[PDB]
């Protein structure tokens, strides 16, 4: 449905004019959109060292409004690239760009990108709140929980360019308690946050196996590829190496296999014969025999695609008297059991999986603030709306309500903003 208009008097954000001279390799940027008749054309990326980058005015997500004094709102994708390719080398082009319409965002997240974003103005108001006697946490929460994670990356850049000190440093010295734990987590890129939460769970021989299972069993292939890279840049050791250090047994093999992020991508053709054979092989390895063939479970549940395994688990009920989750609760035990239980829940319904973990972190005495904060931070821009939807259906009350009754202060207001809505 993304908003579209052919009249420039109906655009939201601010406007930018540019003059780019065509080089031997073009203007140095790519464009997306343009199939759908009513679809904007937006800058997807800028070739570094190219004309668009070395001019510094063009940014990703910019709606191309007009090219060479000709409005291109509603132009097809092929009609626009013909304008840029008709320009000879050495000649320039006039681009009117609109900043304020977003791009590859998640339809199910709760924290969306601020339209009238001003990284300089935000870093200004944060410093004023940080330096306020009796630190003004209200404004800090009002800004950071209302910006996208990449917008927070720009605020951290602007804050350091003005005060010559890091934003994470100044906020760590000004905040305390659980509010600090939330705000510092919101300032990390999703890979950096996961990479830090993983190392934090392998602090010693007393590994937090719960947090290790949560991050590994829920992250996709593309998310885990980024985690493995960022984890080595930050800690100078492979994520797999620390997992091998602080795990053992079949639980080690299941965590290492999932962390590689080499799961077979979702296929376009449904393999009905493999769905049945995988279902029988899970049954033959577990309930049907004495003991369990754990390697056969790890191979099937980590290598097949998620849409495939969902069909495998439904077909599995045709052979076994107990479904896949109940089969796990009696074939294996311990940390291995907790891993297979979480993995299967992330395959069947991942939003429902995080809804249960939020309920578990708040149902009892006190709060598992560690689990609660990580789920709200990590899932705020991915599927937070689906998490709230499954939560209210199953538990009657909203996720907002359970956070309200279990947390207080500005720490509560930070979590409620990441949850979204007024309830």
């Amino acid at each position: 449905k993304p908003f579209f208009t052919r009249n420039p008097s109906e655009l939201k954000g601010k406007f930018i004019h540019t003059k780019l001279r065509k080089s031997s390799r073009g203007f140095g940027f790519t464009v997306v959109g343009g199939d759908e008749p009513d679809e904007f054309l937006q800058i997807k990326s800028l070739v570094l060292d190219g004309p668009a980058a070395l001019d510094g005015k063009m940014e990703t997500g910019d709606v191309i409004v007009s090219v060479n004094d000709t409005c291109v709102l509603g132009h097809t994708h092929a009609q626009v690239v013909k304008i840029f390719q008709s320009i000879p080398i050495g000649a320039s082009v006039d681009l009117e760009l609109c900043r304020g319409y977003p791009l590859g965002s998640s339809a199910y997240g709760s924290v969306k990108a601020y339209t009238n974003f001003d990284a300089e103005r935000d870093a200004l108001n944060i410093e004023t709140a940080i330096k306020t006697k009796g630190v003004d946490e209200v404004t800090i929460v009002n800004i950071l929980t209302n910006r996208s994670n990449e917008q927070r990356q720009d605020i951290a850049f602007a804050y350091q360019r003005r005060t010559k000190k890091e934003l994470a440093s100044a906020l760590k010295s000004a905040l305390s308690g659980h509010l600090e734990t939330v705000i510092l987590g919101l300032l990390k890129t999703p890979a950096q946050y996961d990479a830090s939460e993983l190392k934090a769970s392998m602090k010693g021989l007393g590994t937090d196996e719960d947090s290790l299972i949560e991050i590994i069993c829920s992250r996709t292939n593309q998310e885990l590829q980024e985690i493995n890279r960022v984890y080595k840049e930050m800690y100078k050791t492979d994520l797999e190496k620390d997992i091998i250090s602080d795990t053992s047994g079949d639980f080690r093999k299941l965590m290492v296999a999932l962390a590689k992020g080499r799961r077979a991508e979702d296929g376009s053709v449904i393999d009905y014969e493999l769905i049945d054979q995988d279902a029988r092989d899970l049954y033959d390895a577990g309930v049907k025999r004495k003991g369990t063939d754990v390697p056969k479970w790890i191979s099937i549940m980590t290598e097949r695609s998620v849409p495939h395994l969902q069909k495998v688990f439904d077909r599995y009920k045709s052979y076994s008297p107990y479904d896949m989750l109940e089969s796990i609760r009696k074939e294996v035990k311990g940390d291995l059991e907790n891993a297979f239980l979480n993995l299967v829940q992330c395959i069947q319904n991942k939003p429902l999986y995080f809804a249960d973990r939020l309920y578990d972190s708040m149902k009892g005495k006190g709060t598992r603030d560690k689990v609660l904060i990580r789920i709200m931070v990590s899932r705020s821009e991915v599927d937070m709306l689906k998490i709230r939807s499954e939560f209210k259906r199953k538990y009657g009350k909203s996720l907002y309500y359970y956070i309200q009754q279990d947390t207080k202060g500005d720490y509560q207001k930070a979590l409620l903003y990441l949850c979204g809505g007024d309830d």
Binding site: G26, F27, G28, F29, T30, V31, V32, G33, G34, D35, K44, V47, H77, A78, V81, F84, Q85
Partner: peptide, 6 residues
């Protein structure tokens, strides 16, 4: 998914 370098 239309996408072209310029």
């Amino acid at each position: 998914l239309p996408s072209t370098t310029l």
